[model samples]
Target: DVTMKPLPFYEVYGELIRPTTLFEEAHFTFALTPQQVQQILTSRDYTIQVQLRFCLCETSCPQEDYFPPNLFVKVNGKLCPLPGYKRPSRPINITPLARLSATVPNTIVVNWSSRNYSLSVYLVRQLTAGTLLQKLRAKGIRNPDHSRALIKEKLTADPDSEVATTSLRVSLMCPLGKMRLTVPCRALTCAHLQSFDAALYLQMNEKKPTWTCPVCDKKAPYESLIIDGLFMEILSSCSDCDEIQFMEDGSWCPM
Candidate 1:
C-alpha cells in the first residue's frame, strides 16, 4: 500500500532553435503567477530544470562524430552552470531560486555558439521517488518468463566465451547500490542480465530524476522499469548469502 500524492510541476519556458551557422543570442521573458510561485516556495519539493534536446536520428546525420552545440543560459541575470558532456540530450537544474522575482517577469538569455545542429530548450518545474520497493509492487514486475529465459540464455549464449558450462557465477551485489539487492529490477531496454535494487536506484534519483540505467547508462524511464523476476526468485532462495553460483537450468546455490 504505497500511496503518495503526485507533486506539482509545469513548464516555465521553452524554445526551439533551428539550424544556424552564425553565433546567436536570444532573450525571453516569462512570469510565474503568484500562486505558482507560492506553491514552488511553500511546498519546497518543486524543482526548476532545463533540458536540451537535439535531432540526431536521421540518415544523413553523422551520429558518431556529432558534437553538441555550446549553449548557456542566464536566469534573472544569474548564469547557470551546464554540464560539459556532448550528448544528444542534456538537463541542468536552475537551483538557488532563493532570489527569484516572484511578482515580476523572469528574464532568460540563451547563448548559442555552435552551428549545423538544431536543438530545443525545455524549462519546467517538477516535483520529486522513494519507498521504491512498494512502487515496484504497485507498478508490478515484468513477465517472469521473459526475464528467466533471458538469464538462462545468457548463461551459454556467447560462443566466443568459454565453452557451454553447466554453472555460472552470478554476483548478488548490485553494481549501483554496491550491496546485496533488496528488490531486483532492470530496464527492459537494457540488454544485460545484471540488475540493481529498485529501492536504491529510485532513491538515488529522488533529488534529480535521471532515469538512466545504472548498468548501461541507457534510457530507463519509469515506464520501462520492471522487477527482474528471475533475480527475485534467486534472492529469496539464496537466503542470507551475498553471492551465488547459478546453473544454466535456473537453479542456484550460495557461493
Candidate 2:
C-alpha cells in the first residue's frame, strides 16, 4: 500500500507547494553534510529528485479527474520541467543541478502553471552493499551467526520435508536478474533463504518503488533489507556455478 516511498538514506529538502502562477515559486535551500558528499563521491547511487504526491485520491485516480497542473522546477537556475497526468509517484532525478554545490548550500526554485496538489524534493542515497554492511555491523542486526542459524533452521524445518535427508537446491543467480549477485541480499523479514542482487533491487526501486521481495512477493522496505552473510560466504568459498545444493547442516556444493 505504501509502495510510493523513497529507499533508505534519503534527505528531505522541501515539500508542500501551492503557488499561484509559474512566476510565483517556492524557494528552498539545503546543504548536504560532509559525510554525504564523501559517500556521493565514492558510492554507486546518489540521486537528487522531485516527486509529485497527489492528495485527491488515496489509491488510484485519473489525473484528468483531478486535473493537476503542469509543474516546473529549477535548481541553481537550471530548468527541469514535468508534465501533468494521472502519473503516480515517480521521482525525477535532478542530480546534475545539485552536484554543482553538493557540499555547500544549494537552492531549488519550484512553481506550476496552476495550483499543485502536493509535491516534494528529496535527495535519496540508495543503500549500497558496502553501506548496508556498515549499517548492519553498526546495529549488530544480521551478522554471520544469525544467517548461519537461519540457514540451519530453514534446512531442518520439517523432518518429513524433501530437504531433510539429502540436499536442497539453491542458486547463485539473483531472483530478479537471474544473474550472479553482485551483492547478495535478502530482507530481514524474509523467511526463505533466496537472495537477490542488492544493486539491481535498489536501481529497480528508484525508477518505480514497489519495495517487494522478488523471492516471496512480500513487503521488503529499504530499512528491512540486509546483505545475507551466509550467501556471501558461499559465493566466496565456492568456484563459479549457476546452482548449488545444500545439506541439512548448511554445507553446500556446486550443482
**CA lDDT of each prediction against the hidden true structure:** 0.59, 0.60
User: How many steric clashes does model 1 contain?
Assistant: 0
lDDT for each residue of candidate 1 in 1-255, tens digit (9 for 90 to 100): 111112112344433222222266766555555554554466453455433333333445323223345666676788866655444344444445323445676655667664244333344565334444465568776677886677677676666766666666656788887898877888778997778888777777765667789888998766577887778777777767776776777776777
**Maximum-TM-score candidate:** 1
Those runs of model 1 whose alpha carbons end farther than 4 Å from true positions after fitting are 1-22, 45-68, 84-89, 95-102, 114-128, 131-136, 155-162, 207-223
lDDT by residue for model 2 (60-110), tens: 532211223454667778886444355444455566666534456766776
Candidate 2's displacement at residue 113, Å, is 23
Clashing residue pairs for model 2:
none
Worst 10 residues of 1 by lDDT: 1-10
lDDT of 1: 0.59
